[PDB]
Symmetry: C5
Subunit: 116 residues, 5 copies
Amino acid sequence: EWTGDARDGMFSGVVITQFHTGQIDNKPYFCIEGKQSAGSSISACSMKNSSVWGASFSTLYNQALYFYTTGQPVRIYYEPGVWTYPPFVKALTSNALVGLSTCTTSTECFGPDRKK
Amino acid sequence: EWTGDARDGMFSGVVITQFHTGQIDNKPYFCIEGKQSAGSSISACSMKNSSVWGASFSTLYNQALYFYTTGQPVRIYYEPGVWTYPPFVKALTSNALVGLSTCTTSTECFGPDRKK
Amino acid sequence: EWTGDARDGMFSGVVITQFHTGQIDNKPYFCIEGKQSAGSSISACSMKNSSVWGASFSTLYNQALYFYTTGQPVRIYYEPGVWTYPPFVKALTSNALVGLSTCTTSTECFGPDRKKN
Amino acid sequence: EWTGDARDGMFSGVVITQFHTGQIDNKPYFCIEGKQSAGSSISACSMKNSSVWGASFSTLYNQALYFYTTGQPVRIYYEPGVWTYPPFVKALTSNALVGLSTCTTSTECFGPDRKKNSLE
Amino acid sequence: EWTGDARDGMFSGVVITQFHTGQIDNKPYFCIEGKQSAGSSISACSMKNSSVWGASFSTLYNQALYFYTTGQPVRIYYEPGVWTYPPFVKALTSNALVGLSTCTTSTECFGPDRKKN
Ligand SMILES: [C]C(=O)[N][C]1[C](O[C][C][C][N-]=[N+]=[N-])O[C]([C][O])[C]([O])[C]1O[C]1O[C]([C][O])[C]([O])[C](O[C@@]2(C([O])=O)[C][C]([O])[C]([N]C(=O)[C][O])[C]([C]([O])[C]([O])[C][O])O2)[C]1[O]
Ligand SMILES: [C]C(=O)[N][C]1[C](O[C][C][C][N-]=[N+]=[N-])O[C]([C][O])[C]([O])[C]1O[C]1O[C]([C][O])[C]([O])[C](O[C@]2(C([O])=O)[C][C]([O])[C]([N]C(=O)[C][O])[C]([C]([O])[C]([O])[C][O])O2)[C]1[O]
Ligand SMILES: [C]C(=O)[N][C]1[C](O[C][C][C][N-]=[N+]=[N-])O[C]([C][O])[C]([O])[C]1O[C]1O[C]([C][O])[C]([O])[C](O[C@]2(C([O])=O)[C][C]([O])[C]([N]C(=O)[C][O])[C]([C]([O])[C]([O])[C][O])O2)[C]1[O]
Ligand SMILES: [C]C(=O)[N][C]1[C](O[C][C][C][N-]=[N+]=[N-])O[C]([C][O])[C]([O])[C]1O[C]1O[C]([C][O])[C]([O])[C](O[C@]2(C([O])=O)[C][C]([O])[C]([N]C(=O)[C][O])[C]([C]([O])[C]([O])[C][O])O2)[C]1[O]
């Protein structure tokens, strides 16, 4: 697997506006929410020692909280359909957070594309 | 188990006003106290390596200290009756700290409801 | 053992003014000095992987450096006679740092008391 | 191996301007981009438990994010040809980040040179 | 072994002005450079998992970067002759960083002396 795999998906020029941390199945997790200037919203969660993307938890939490603090427009890389516990998906999202990037414009950000 | 389980409980729109850290039974712990603008108060502790909520100790420590620093209104997810050692409950609380969220309003905060 | 055991002791409303880190017997340690006002000094050190209170080293380091930075009056929970290497005690203290609390006044602080009955 | 080995290479007086984090093959990684005074770019990636430079991931991540925050002109030490997965190299770089230093000038920086020797 | 051992040595009232991090022999390390009021210079490196002082790497990195950020005058505790790889020593120093202290004056700092007899 790779953050820059030709898959869904990414949202660019996102300001991280909301932050939530919790626990499920003996694993700490965090979720972020971001809004583009056009009003489009994206939610993505990361879990410690989880499925495929668990190894990134520590780095993503640090980066996400950093980006929440500065308020800078960033790129959210996500993989849909990862989290499957229905009440979790309902209240939050099925999206796993798979990467983060700084942006130069609302569409142009550092690093790989993640798109079909 | 999950932060968003249909149980007690959560306080929304809380400013974290007090912070305590210590050790019991070879386990580090921290407790927070927070006030809602109505002056209503909530206490919760997180303890490393404890039974159910111990896994999220360091994540919650980092996040609670972050929120204490910013002074922003947040949501405290707790579970009552977790700590049972009487002098500990008397001095602090039985409530385990179970999650944290940023809030858009005094009652509306990011993530799941923890509601019985 | 517990931070809030009815034992010696605690110093409430302390501004942490001094900070030191070193190593002894393959173990990193930090130590703090602060004044009440009042005016009296308290010193306490925490040591990684130390016998009784080693579990709290990482948390207390983080919290102590935070409180040193803000300058806010805080409570120092300590256990006397923990550190025993005589030059260490002479230059620093025998006091182990066993907990920290935020304070509302110079004596009223969040969390348990640590005092003898 | 050593950061100060007589090899390619180093860029001095670099301001870290871009930051990216991700995962590949079950390993977290971060990448940085920086600009020198004239606008010339250098990219370098650090990857946890990777090749020979994997041990430095945590320190480099902390230090690079620190310098990104301050906007200090810094020395980027790098080793080309380390990352070999083609889409990764194409999107980012083959350069591994192998060191960081503060700088007193745009060209004078603390610590060793990472430089090929010249021929007499 | 201890930071406050009667050995070489210490520089008091230094401002940490330069910071370097890298890797040698699969070990992450960092080095600092500090200047005293008079202009006198001191360099010291801390290396993860290396020699007797390796256990302090994380604490010392955290504390040195903190002190570099504040720019406050501090005490560098060091041990000369620890690093032996000639190109490393030439480009940086043989001195291992063994401890750090806040200072009240240019000579008076918190904690032990590290002085020869
Ligand atoms: C510029 C750019 O950006 N590009 C493009 C263009 O091209 C041109 C050429 C030049 N180049 N330079 N660089 O074109 C245009 C038309 O006019 C367009 O197409 C563009 O693109 C863009 O767009 C935008 C708006 O529409 C958007 O879409 C973008 O994308 C994204 C981002 O943001 O980035 C991508 C993707 O991934 C996403 N997602 C999906 O698809 C699913 O997941 C999208 C969306 O959806 C989101 O964001 C929400 O809104 O988008 C682009 O880039
Ligand atoms: C969120 C909100 O706002 N909700 C509600 C409403 O609904 C609407 C819908 C939603 N969505 N939107 N979009 O409605 C209204 C009228 O009807 C109201 O009711 C609201 O509610 C509220 O209220 C209040 C009072 O009355 C309160 O309750 C709140 O919250 C809480 C918080 O804080 O969060 C919830 C609960 O959970 C809690 N807790 C408990 O129960 C314990 O465990 C509460 C209280 O009690 C506390 O806080 C104390 O103070 O609250 C709500 O929400
Ligand atoms: C010192 C100096 O500066 N060096 C040199 C000189 O020398 C002088 C004498 C000795 N003594 N003192 N100390 O010389 C000159 C002529 O003759 C020259 O060569 C110099 O060099 C320089 O140059 C420049 C040009 O622009 C540059 O190159 C510099 O730097 C660098 C940095 O940045 O650091 C170095 C190197 O390493 C690099 N890299 C490479 O090569 C590969 O990697 C370079 C470049 O390329 C970059 O940066 C881009 O821009 O550069 C030098 O130093
Ligand atoms: C207190 C003090 O400071 N000391 C002294 C004095 O006092 C005496 C009395 C008793 N004590 N009190 N308690 O006196 C004076 C006049 O005589 C003097 O001597 C002093 O001393 C000082 O001096 C200075 C100049 O010379 C210096 O030396 C100082 O310090 C040091 C530091 O910095 O810390 C010390 C030592 O350790 C060092 N090092 C060595 O030796 C080797 O490592 C020194 C030097 O060398 C350096 O720094 C260079 O710069 O110094 C003293 O303290």
